[PDB]
Amino acid sequence: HMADKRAHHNALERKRRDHIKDSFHSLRDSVPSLQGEKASRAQILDKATEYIQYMRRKNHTHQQDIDDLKRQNALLEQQVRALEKAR
Amino acid sequence: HMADKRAHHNALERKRRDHIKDSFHSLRDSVPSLQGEKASRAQILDKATEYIQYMRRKNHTHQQDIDDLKRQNALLEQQVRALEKAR
DNA sequence: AGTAGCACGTGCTACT
DNA sequence: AGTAGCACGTGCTACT
């Protein structure tokens, strides 16, 4: 019957929607701005998006800084090895 | 009437849900894994969560590496300035 | 044939 | 008094 066909479809929908609620919970706890405080689904999506843009830019600049200091370490190590050839 | 009260509540719900659909679109485009390809809402929430854990760890190690090279640049710059005092 | 996924509707709580 | 937000239901498309 229809009441049997609906109850089965409704059951499969709740179990799938409980997995989504768990994912919002996990995502909300992944953003330090929303961690521990009850936030709406609109805020979780938007803040995580802003936080991903922040992490990508900050990780990009840090990678640039690592390359700078490595090149600077290379010129310094070579200048020590050269100055150590003198007396 | 009820049909008037429902239509107004349904209208406010669609406009709010269209903003959430826009946020999933923005979030999906923030993850390089899901960018450009049609992904479900369960995947957007889970992959962004995995990508945030990845960015936080990789940004933490890069910050650690910047501190190492800076301390190493400091000992190298000092060793050059000392060796430059000789002849 | 069965279902994942989503648009849309609905009624309630808890706010403003 | 009005509504944001959510749990839950419902019917369809598009897959397996």
From Swiss-Prot, chains A, B:
Question: What would changing R6W do, according to UniProt?
Answer: In PCC; does not repress MYC transcriptional activity
For this UniProt record, the keywords arranged alphabetically read as follows: Acetylation, Activator, Cell projection, Disease variant, DNA-binding, Nucleus, Phosphoprotein, Repressor, Transcription, Transcription regulation
The outcome of changing R71P is:
In PCC; does not repress MYC transcriptional activity
Q: Is Repressor among the key words of this record?
A: yes
The Gene Ontology CC terms held by the record are: chromatin; dendrite; Mad-Max complex; MLL1 complex; Myc-Max complex; nucleoplasm; nucleus; protein-DNA complex
UniProt feature, compositional bias: Basic and acidic residues: 10-21
| Keyword field contains rRNA-binding | no
One annotated GO molecular function is: protein dimerization activity
Q: What is the effect of changing R41Q?
A: In PDMCS; likely pathogenic; results in increased MYC transcriptional activity; increased interaction with MYC; decreased MAX binding to its target E-box sequences
**Region Leucine-zipper: which residues?**
62-83
Which residues lie in coiled coils?
Answer: none
Q: Name one GO biological process term.
A: positive regulation of transcription by RNA polymerase II
Please state every residue range assigned to the domain named bHLH. Answer: 4-55
- Could you tell me which cysteines form disulfide bridges? none
The linked condition is: Pheochromocytoma: A catecholamine-producing tumor of chromaffin tissue of the adrenal medulla or sympathetic paraganglia. The cardinal symptom, reflecting the increased secretion of epinephrine and norepinephrine, is hypertension, which may be persistent or intermittent. Polydactyly-macrocephaly syndrome: An autosomal dominant syndrome characterized by progressive macrocephaly and post-axial polydactyly, a condition defined by the occurrence of supernumerary digits affecting the fifth finger and/or toe. Additional variable features include ocular anomalies, global developmental delay and autistic traits.
* Family the entry assigns: Belongs to the MAX family.
User: What's this chain's function?
Assistant: Transcription regulator. Forms a sequence-specific DNA-binding protein complex with MYC or MAD which recognizes the core sequence 5'-CAC[GA]TG-3'. The MYC:MAX complex is a transcriptional activator, whereas the MAD:MAX complex is a repressor. May repress transcription via the recruitment of a chromatin remodeling complex containing H3 'Lys-9' histone methyltransferase activity. Represses MYC transcriptional activity from E-box elements.
What's the name of the protein?
Protein max
Q: Which gene encodes it?
A: MAX
Note the residue range shown relative to the complete protein: 22 to 106 of 160
